[PDB]
Amino acid sequence: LKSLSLIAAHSHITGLGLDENLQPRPTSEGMVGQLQARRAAGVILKMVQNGTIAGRAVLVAGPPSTGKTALAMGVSQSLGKDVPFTAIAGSEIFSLELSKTEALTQAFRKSIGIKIKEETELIEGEVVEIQIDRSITGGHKQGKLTIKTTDMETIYELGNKMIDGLTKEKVLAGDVISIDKASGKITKLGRSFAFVQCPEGELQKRKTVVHTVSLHEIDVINSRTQGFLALFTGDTGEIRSEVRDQINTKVAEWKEEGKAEIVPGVLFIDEVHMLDIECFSFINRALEDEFAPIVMMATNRGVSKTRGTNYKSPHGLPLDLLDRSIIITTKSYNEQEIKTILSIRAQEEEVELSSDALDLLTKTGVETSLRYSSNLISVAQQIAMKRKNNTVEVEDVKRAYLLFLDSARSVKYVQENESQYIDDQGNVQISIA
Amino acid sequence: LKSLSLIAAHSHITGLGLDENLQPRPTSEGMVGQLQARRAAGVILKMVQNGTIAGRAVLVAGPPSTGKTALAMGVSQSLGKDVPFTAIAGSEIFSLELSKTEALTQAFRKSIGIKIKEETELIEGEVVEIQIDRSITGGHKQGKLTIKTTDMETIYELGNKMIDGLTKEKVLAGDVISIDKASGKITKLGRSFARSRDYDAMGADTRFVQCPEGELQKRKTVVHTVSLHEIDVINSRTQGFLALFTGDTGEIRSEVRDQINTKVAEWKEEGKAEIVPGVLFIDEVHMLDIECFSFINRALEDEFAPIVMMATNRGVSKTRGTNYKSPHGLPLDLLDRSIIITTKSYNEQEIKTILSIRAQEEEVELSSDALDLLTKTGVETSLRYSSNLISVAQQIAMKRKNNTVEVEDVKRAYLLFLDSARSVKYVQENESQYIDDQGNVQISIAK
Amino acid sequence: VNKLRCDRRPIFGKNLIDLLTKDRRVKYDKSSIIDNELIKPLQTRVLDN
Amino acid sequence: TRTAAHTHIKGLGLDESGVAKRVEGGFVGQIEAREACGVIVDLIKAKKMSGRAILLAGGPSTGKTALALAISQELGPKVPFCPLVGSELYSVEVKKTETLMENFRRAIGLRIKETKEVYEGEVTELTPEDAENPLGGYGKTISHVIVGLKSAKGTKTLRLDPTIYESIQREKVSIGDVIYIEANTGAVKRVGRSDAYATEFDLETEEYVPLPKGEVHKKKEIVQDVTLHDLDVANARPQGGQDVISMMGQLLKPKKTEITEKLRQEVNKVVAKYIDQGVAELIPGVLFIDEVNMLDIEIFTYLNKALESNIAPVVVLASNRGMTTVRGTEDVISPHGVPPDLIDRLLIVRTLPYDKDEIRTIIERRATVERLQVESSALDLLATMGTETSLRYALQLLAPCGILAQTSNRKEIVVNDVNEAKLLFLDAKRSTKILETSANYL
Amino acid sequence: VTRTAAHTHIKGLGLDESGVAKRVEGGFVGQIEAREACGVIVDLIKAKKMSGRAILLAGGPSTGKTALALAISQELGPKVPFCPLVGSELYSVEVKKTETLMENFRRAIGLRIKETKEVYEGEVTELTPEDAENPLGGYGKTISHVIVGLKSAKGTKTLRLDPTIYESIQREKVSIGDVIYIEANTGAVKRVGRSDAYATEFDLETEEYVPLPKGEVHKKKEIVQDVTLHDLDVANARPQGGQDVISMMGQLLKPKKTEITEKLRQEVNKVVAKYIDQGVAELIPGVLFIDEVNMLDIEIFTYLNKALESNIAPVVVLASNRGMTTVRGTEDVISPHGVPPDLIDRLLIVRTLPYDKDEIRTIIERRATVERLQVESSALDLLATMGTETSLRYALQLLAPCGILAQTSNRKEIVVNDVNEAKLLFLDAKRSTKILETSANYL
Numbered sequence A: 001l002k003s004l005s006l007i008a009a010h011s012h013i014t015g016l017g018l019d020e021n022l023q024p025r026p027t028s029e030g031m032v033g034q035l036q037a038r039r040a041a042g043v044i045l046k047m048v049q050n051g052t053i054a055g056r057a058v059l060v061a062g063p064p065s066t067g068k069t070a071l072a073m074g075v076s077q078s079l080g081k082d083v084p085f086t087a088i089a090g091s092e093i094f095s096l097e098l099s100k101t102e103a104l105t106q107a108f109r110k111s112i113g114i115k116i117k118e119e120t121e122l123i124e125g126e127v128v129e130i131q132i133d134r135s136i137t138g139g140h141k142q143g144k145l146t147i148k149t150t151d152m153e154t155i156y157e158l159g160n161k162m163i164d165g166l167t168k169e170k171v172l173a174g175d176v177i178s179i180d181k182a183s184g185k186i187t188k189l190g191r192s193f194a195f196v197q198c199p200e201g202e203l204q205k206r207k208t209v210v211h212t213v214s215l216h217e218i219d220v221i222n223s224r225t226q227g228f229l230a231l232f233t234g235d236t237g238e239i240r241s242e243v244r245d246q247i248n249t250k251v252a253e254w255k256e257e258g259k260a261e262i263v264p265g266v267l268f269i270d271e272v273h274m275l276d277i278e279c280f281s282f283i284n285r286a287l288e289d290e291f292a293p294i295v296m297m298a299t300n301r302g303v304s305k306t307r308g309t310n311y312k313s314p315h316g317l318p319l320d321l322l323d324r325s326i327i328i329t330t331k332s333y334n335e336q337e338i339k340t341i342l343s344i345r346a347q348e349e350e351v352e353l354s355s356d357a358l359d360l361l362t363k364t365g366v367e368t369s370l371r372y373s374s375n376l377i378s379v380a381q382q383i384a385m386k387r388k389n390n391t392v393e394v395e396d397v398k399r400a401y402l403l404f405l406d407s408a409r410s411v412k413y414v415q416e417n418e419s420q421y422i423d424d425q426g427n428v429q430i431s432i433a
Numbered sequence B: 001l002k003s004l005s006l007i008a009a010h011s012h013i014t015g016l017g018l019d020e021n022l023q024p025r026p027t028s029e030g031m032v033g034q035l036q037a038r039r040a041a042g043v044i045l046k047m048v049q050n051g052t053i054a055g056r057a058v059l060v061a062g063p064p065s066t067g068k069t070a071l072a073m074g075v076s077q078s079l080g081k082d083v084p085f086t087a088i089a090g091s092e093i094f095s096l097e098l099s100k101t102e103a104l105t106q107a108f109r110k111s112i113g114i115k116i117k118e119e120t121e122l123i124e125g126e127v128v129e130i131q132i133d134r135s136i137t138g139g140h141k142q143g144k145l146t147i148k149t150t151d152m153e154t155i156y157e158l159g160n161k162m163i164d165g166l167t168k169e170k171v172l173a174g175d176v177i178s179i180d181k182a183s184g185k186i187t188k189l190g191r192s193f194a195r196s197r198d199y200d201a202m203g204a205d206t207r208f209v210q211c212p213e214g215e216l217q218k219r220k221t222v223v224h225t226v227s228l229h230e231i232d233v234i235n236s237r238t239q240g241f242l243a244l245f246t247g248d249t250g251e252i253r254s255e256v257r258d259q260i261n262t263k264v265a266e267w268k269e270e271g272k273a274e275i276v277p278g279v280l281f282i283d284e285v286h287m288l289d290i291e292c293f294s295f296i297n298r299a300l301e302d303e304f305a306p307i308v309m310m311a312t313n314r315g316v317s318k319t320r321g322t323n324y325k326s327p328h329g330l331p332l333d334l335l336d337r338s339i340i341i342t343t344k345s346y347n348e349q350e351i352k353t354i355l356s357i358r359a360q361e362e363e364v365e366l367s368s369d370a371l372d373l374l375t376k377t378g379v380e381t382s383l384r385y386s387s388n389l390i391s392v393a394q395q396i397a398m399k400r401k402n403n404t405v406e407v408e409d410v411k412r413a414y415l416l417f418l419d420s421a422r423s424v425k426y427v428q429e430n431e432s433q434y435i436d437d438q439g440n441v442q443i444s445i446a447k
Numbered sequence C: 001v002n003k004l005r006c007d008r009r010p011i012f013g014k015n016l017i018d019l020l021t022k023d024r025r026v027k028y029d030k031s032s033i034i035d036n037e038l039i040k041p042l043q044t045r046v047l048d049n
Numbered sequence D: 001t002r003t004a005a006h007t008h009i010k011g012l013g014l015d016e017s018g019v020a021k022r023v024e025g026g027f028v029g030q031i032e033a034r035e036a037c038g039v040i041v042d043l044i045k046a047k048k049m050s051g052r053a054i055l056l057a058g059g060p061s062t063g064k065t066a067l068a069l070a071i072s073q074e075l076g077p078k079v080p081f082c083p084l085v086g087s088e089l090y091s092v093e094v095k096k097t098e099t100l101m102e103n104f105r106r107a108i109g110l111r112i113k114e115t116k117e118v119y120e121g122e123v124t125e126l127t128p129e130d131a132e133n134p135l136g137g138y139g140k141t142i143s144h145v146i147v148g149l150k151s152a153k154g155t156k157t158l159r160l161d162p163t164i165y166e167s168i169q170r171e172k173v174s175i176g177d178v179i180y181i182e183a184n185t186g187a188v189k190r191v192g193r194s195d196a197y198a199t200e201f202d203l204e205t206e207e208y209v210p211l212p213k214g215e216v217h218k219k220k221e222i223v224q225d226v227t228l229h230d231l232d233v234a235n236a237r238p239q240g241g242q243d244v245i246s247m248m249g250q251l252l253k254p255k256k257t258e259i260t261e262k263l264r265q266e267v268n269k270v271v272a273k274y275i276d277q278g279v280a281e282l283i284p285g286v287l288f289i290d291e292v293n294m295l296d297i298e299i300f301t302y303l304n305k306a307l308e309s310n311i312a313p314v315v316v317l318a319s320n321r322g323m324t325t326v327r328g329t330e331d332v333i334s335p336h337g338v339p340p341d342l343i344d345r346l347l348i349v350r351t352l353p354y355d356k357d358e359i360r361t362i363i364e365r366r367a368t369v370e371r372l373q374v375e376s377s378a379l380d381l382l383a384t385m386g387t388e389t390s391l392r393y394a395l396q397l398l399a400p401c402g403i404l405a406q407t408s409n410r411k412e413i414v415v416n417d418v419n420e421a422k423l424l425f426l427d428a429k430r431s432t433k434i435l436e437t438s439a440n441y442l
Numbered sequence E: 001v002t003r004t005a006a007h008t009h010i011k012g013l014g015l016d017e018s019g020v021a022k023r024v025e026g027g028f029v030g031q032i033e034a035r036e037a038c039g040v041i042v043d044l045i046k047a048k049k050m051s052g053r054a055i056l057l058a059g060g061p062s063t064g065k066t067a068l069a070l071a072i073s074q075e076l077g078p079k080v081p082f083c084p085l086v087g088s089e090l091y092s093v094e095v096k097k098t099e100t101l102m103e104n105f106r107r108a109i110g111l112r113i114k115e116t117k118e119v120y121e122g123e124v125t126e127l128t129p130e131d132a133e134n135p136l137g138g139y140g141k142t143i144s145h146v147i148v149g150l151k152s153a154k155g156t157k158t159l160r161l162d163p164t165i166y167e168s169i170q171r172e173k174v175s176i177g178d179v180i181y182i183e184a185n186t187g188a189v190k191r192v193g194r195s196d197a198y199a200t201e202f203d204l205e206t207e208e209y210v211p212l213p214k215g216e217v218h219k220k221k222e223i224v225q226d227v228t229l230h231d232l233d234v235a236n237a238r239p240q241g242g243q244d245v246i247s248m249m250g251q252l253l254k255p256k257k258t259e260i261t262e263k264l265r266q267e268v269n270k271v272v273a274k275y276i277d278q279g280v281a282e283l284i285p286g287v288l289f290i291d292e293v294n295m296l297d298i299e300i301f302t303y304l305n306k307a308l309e310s311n312i313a314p315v316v317v318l319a320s321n322r323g324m325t326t327v328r329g330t331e332d333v334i335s336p337h338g339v340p341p342d343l344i345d346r347l348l349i350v351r352t353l354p355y356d357k358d359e360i361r362t363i364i365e366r367r368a369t370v371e372r373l374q375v376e377s378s379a380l381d382l383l384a385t386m387g388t389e390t391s392l393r394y395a396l397q398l399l400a401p402c403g404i405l406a407q408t409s410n411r412k413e414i415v416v417n418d419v420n421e422a423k424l425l426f427l428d429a430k431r432s433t434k435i436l437e438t439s440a441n442y443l
């Protein structure tokens, strides 16, 4: 129910928080401001929830300290369970054991999943007693027991393999167990009278079981007999393309038969400004396949040089990828919006702030970067904890301000002391006299 | 003497020429001159023999052929056996199998040693008769075996589990075996001498040893010297001892190293194992990657850091991996934590002693006038040069069959083999004949 | 046979078998723990899947 | 007693809820720096925030690393602290990204505590108890098994369910042998024979342990801590002696493999399951990267997305350099070598050079740990030399002056000894000045 | 019949006992200085006292450097190990170049091993087990000894064996009438095959047949085989022993080079250092030869400095052509011959002179005599002028095709018209560049 969780930057935001009309609310579901951005992201949200379209790319641009990464986080949160969501960094695709193109395809394979359902019978009931028949050095053994439930009291003989299972996990008359016929697995809900009541209903019931497996897993399983170990060990390379071409046909047949349904996922890539050109040239073609997960990116870089080429392309990506991709920009934050973000960060971290400390923190947060002002709010509580009261006061924020330096403040301090710091040329003065 | 007897660059240097007052002798212990540098090395020598300090670096500086390599080599000889020493090169730590960081970590690990002592209680003696009853009554009837030693003989009762253990590694008696006291392990040393005449051709397992002398069971302690690196390689693999000889380490994870450090800490607390501080010497460090420099800067501050000494003859020059030129060829951070020892070029008076002391090593008798020409050519050339001419002139004089090397043979030896300065001139005049950087060469002599 | 025995016998272990088991065996006890349920080795996952 | 450039640092040296003392824990000066780090110690002890990084910048020999060792001391031995260098990220086995992600998960530890009741002692005797079976039968029926236990200072008799006969048969214990019995889990364990039985046989291969001390019934608790990475390695690595996959483990070589995200999340699931029941306790640790200037821009990029992770711990950075070109990009210029986007996510802690009066106290405090004592006259030279040449030079000259003092048999350093040590060992500036006057290529 | 590639006409240096070089000897013409210079090298190699000494011979292209480097190897003899090496071969994908350099360094030196073995061989007449009626308490069932008779042409003998070496025979599935090989030292039994006289027993047979071994029964022999130290290291790294299923797959896997630790090398030097003290073994030095040393990286050049200072370092000879050029792996460094000056300081420099035209005319003559062909003198002069106008190695290449045109013209001797015809079909580099400069697409 709860994965290991600590206070994080993207913690507070849950869901995209859009109206049924798709218009954004001023403050909803942890997100504040950025109207056109959240709406344009919601169009993509209902676009994925439709699932009738494939092979589309979209880009989220902007300067630093935007929330485009937060926006995509809100799209992944509003996406909900049962929809696979894969987020990889741009520098992750580079690998020594695997090719960059092969790993790039491996990223496309993980995003789209497949659901398969099946029905398995189940017997759940209390035990009256157990009777086993064995012989010392005599081989064959014979078990018998008696299962009891409110409306049904019956007696079942024990098979050869049922004996080993009942001996593996201790079964008693007091203990209530539930066993599947086909699986043969023994499941103990707990202990009855020496705290669960006898199960209601019939002794034998049939319930459906659903299994969900990503395309990448099916791809790795069929490569080698030990290829199943490559799932957990993560060691696999140069998967045969013929295996993928066969898997696509088998999955298509599974869709036509109605046996297995596919769930389209979302692929998210962070820091796409640095990527090799072979990766882009492979993406251009790879987005046109029948199963292509919806791709959303993030680029905070302006006009710069693409890695692998000497020339400088606009936005940091070649124009071939900019063509088929859609560009969703972002804008800076108002002075009041920063105050709202800092306030909801205080609510997420559960830290009470004074009004004057909120105004001062908003001013020094507008002058400097926003993420820095969000960084001080966590230390303010620790500094105020020594004062033995729980509050954030302007004095404590000033002390935290002189203790921790802003980047722009450190730029000057480096520039005056440059003789003390190590120059790019290598010269440094370590002596005061 | 245990090492191979083939002569090396410097075979004459043994130990250092410092007294108990550390004042160097002008010619002693195989070396010559370099008084201040030798004393500065002896301070490091007592610094290692003390063992109370750790994590320090020292540098040896000088031009080529100044004695920097014969200096650190003299330190390893005076240091003696049982004190672990590691001499590598900066270019050797570049490997495709290991990363430079881990390859340098192993270079720091091999230098520091560990001495482990262990005591054993064993019962060793020759067997006379072994009786085991089976069908008389049954069920481990308590057979008895008689063990014989030269000065003592006793009879031992055998338990049921010992009855089962004696069946494996079957013993007919007439044999010398040893049984561990703690674990009851049975070990077969080999047959006695009376069994040698039974067969004309015998297997490869058989052998003959004398009957053990003295008491039947004894208490003996054994001492072992194992470096931390060997411990880490052994603990890293199921079988790591084969990985030692095959040379494939596998880039041991740094997680195991902390566990090994705790193990050594507990062994030192119990007093079973004491550590010997080692020495690490890296030759020609002027070529090294910057990542290795930073990792040396950090790795020198740990609890076990072997004393590091290095020699670099480069002046102010560009470091490998960066565009800028740092002085000495090393970053200023590595020079900040270090101590620099400078060596000065030899004079004429010292060179002739370095020559004759070399002829004593090559066992080549020289005339009084041969050292004059060899020294005169030794001043213009480098000291490391004429030392080869002292070797060739011995063969040229051997063709003339007469005793010591005559001066004329030295002149012929100098005439046949060109100096490094002359080849530059012969190349500069003949440039059209030799290949050029641009690739242009004139093969044909006809114009 | 004298030279045969003079050759065969001096076989010296470069380190030891007792040094291999001396630097391996752990002083710490077994300490039976629930960590056995926190491991689930790769071989068992083939059976559970 | 080994001392390398350290060990005179004991903790941060703070006081209770106040400004740091002038001199404590071998620290002199820089009260603001170790105070600001003092707040970071509280932030780490809070065990709440995640992926929060800080960077202390300053010139060389300003005490950058000693602060990280100090906070490492302040956290305690139980809190995991991983020393790491930026040069270690490059490995031939796996990509740098996987090594960085692995070191990121090496920081957080997990503690497990377990209380189990035990029954240990010798065996006085074993007798069955016959009772009537529920359904009539001719053969024997045993209701319970009686087991006596003898230990030092006490004795006890127990009654067990008849199902214990299978475990006792498995352990093959009969009489006069010390056993191991766990209360609720049950069965048995045979540690070894009792000590008084060694005399009955002159030669035996079974060891005899003494009777257990104290009561026969005991309750003890054992706490075991394991990091999440060490937990993941055991999950990914196969374990068996004779297994065919394990058979391929031998004769081949193990190499570090990139661990999938699915496995990490799967371990997080069971760790969360045990932390919900109260049996597990998750303590975040601290990662420390020295010389961050040596990191490529590809790692700096992965730190941006990595620090925003939920389980990401607190990582402290140190960069001595000033404005430099980031590795991997020739045109880009950023302070300290850290890209501005990454600088935006952290807090900078400045460091200042030490005063002359602080330097003299540094050397005089180093003398105590060095165990060497110096006069007042020779110390004043070490101060001026330390300020002119460099700080680490006067600290490096301490041992040679003591060895020369032992050659002169004097127990304390003298001005003549520090001058003689000055002539033998040269600092950087003198050597660089000698290189210019020599045409020998020196 | 016989193959000749730019070589095989040099049988050695051809030096007199006084060290003076003849005008022409052993397929070598001129170059008295360089010949006398290498003879002293051969003497130093025979002296065995010096180790790690190195001598560099550098000259222009086609000056006879390499041809002389083969002549010294011919002068040393087959017993002295000689390992040819090229700088471009030191780079390997499996292991770092350094381990390959140090590896060849140990491949140069070599060691001789002598050991005596005694073997009983012959046809098995009658073999019987002998069981002891005494139980002894140690075993349930065993044998005291096994007697196996052996038949040979010179005589027959009966042997008394232990049950283990008989168990080996039972593993070999030996039956009466089959020749066996039993060695006393290792105690190994090998079945050669069934005796030849028994072949007529069956019409069709799978087993091979061999004659009965000569010799009485027992034989005493020693083996003087010489083996390099590096071969002891490789045999030390990969064990051939054991029946384990792991060892089988270990034999199946391809050999992969690995970096050998210094400890193992030190142990091998210890056991060899003991065997040379017992007199059972004798160590001999050997010569390492590297061609195109200029192709080496500055890393290998630096490691050569530490490698030459080792005691086991063999004599190595270097040969380079180019003048002062930028050393590979260095940016602004310029050094003569493409070798760093610190290494040049260690070596000894020998210079190689070019060849006069009158010497070239004799070179073509000797190459023709070894080529066995027939050349007219009038065409010999033209071939000499041709060789002097273009290159020395071009006329030696011109001797080959003319022999074919002479056969098509049926003439036994080469004629001026034949070589004049051969010049038009085959061009040298100078003409190829001239025609290369003016053309449409890259000539």
Ligand SMILES: Nc1ncnc2c1ncn2[C@@H]1O[C@H](COP(=O)(O)OP(=O)(O)O)[C@@H](O)[C@H]1O
Residues within 6 Å of the ligand: A009, A010, A013, A030, A031, A032, A033, A034, A063, A064, A065, A066, A067, A068, A069, A070, A300, A341, A371, A374
């Ligand atoms: N609309 C928003 N609602 C809440 N938080 C926001 C919003 N926009 C930005 N943020 C804050 O910005 C911080 C990180 O900004 P981010 O988008 O990661 O910068 P970059 O675009 O450089 O990656 C997050 O901690 C988040 O709290």
Ligand SMILES: Nc1ncnc2c1ncn2[C@@H]1O[C@H](COP(=O)(O)OP(=O)(O)O)[C@@H](O)[C@H]1O
Residues within 6 Å of the ligand: B009, B010, B030, B031, B032, B033, B034, B062, B063, B064, B065, B066, B067, B068, B069, B070, B071, B311, B313, B354, B383, B384, B387
């Ligand atoms: N103390 C000494 N006494 C005699 N000869 C020496 C001494 N030191 C060095 N040499 C000579 O110097 C040569 C080695 O110089 P080396 O230390 O290798 O210079 P570098 O290390 O600069 O290359 C040897 O041939 C040796 O004869």
Ligand SMILES: Nc1ncnc2c1ncn2[C@@H]1O[C@H](COP(=O)(O)OP(=O)(O)O)[C@@H](O)[C@H]1O
Residues within 6 Å of the ligand: D005, D006, D026, D027, D028, D029, D030, D058, D059, D060, D061, D062, D063, D064, D065, D066, D320, D362
């Ligand atoms: N407060 C202090 N008191 C005494 N010595 C100090 C103090 N701070 C630093 N040092 C000295 O500085 C050295 C560590 O310097 P370090 O921080 O590694 O330099 P850099 O900043 O270049 O990393 C230690 O050996 C220690 O003796």
Ligand SMILES: Nc1ncnc2c1ncn2[C@@H]1O[C@H](COP(=O)(O)OP(=O)(O)O)[C@@H](O)[C@H]1O
Residues within 6 Å of the ligand: E006, E007, E027, E028, E029, E030, E031, E060, E061, E062, E063, E064, E065, E066, E067, E068, E321, E363, E393
């Ligand atoms: N002095 C000589 N006598 C006879 N043949 C020679 C002589 N010098 C060179 N050659 C011939 O020249 C050919 C090529 O010369 P080579 O030694 O390969 O030149 P390089 O040393 O530049 O490689 C060889 O096949 C050799 O037969």
Ligand SMILES: [Mg+2]
Residues within 6 Å of the ligand: A069, A270, A271, A298, A300, D304
């Ligand atoms: Mg971002």
Ligand SMILES: [Mg+2]
Residues within 6 Å of the ligand: B068, B069, B283, B284, B311
């Ligand atoms: Mg050297």
Ligand SMILES: [Mg+2]
Residues within 6 Å of the ligand: D064, D065, D290
């Ligand atoms: Mg530091």
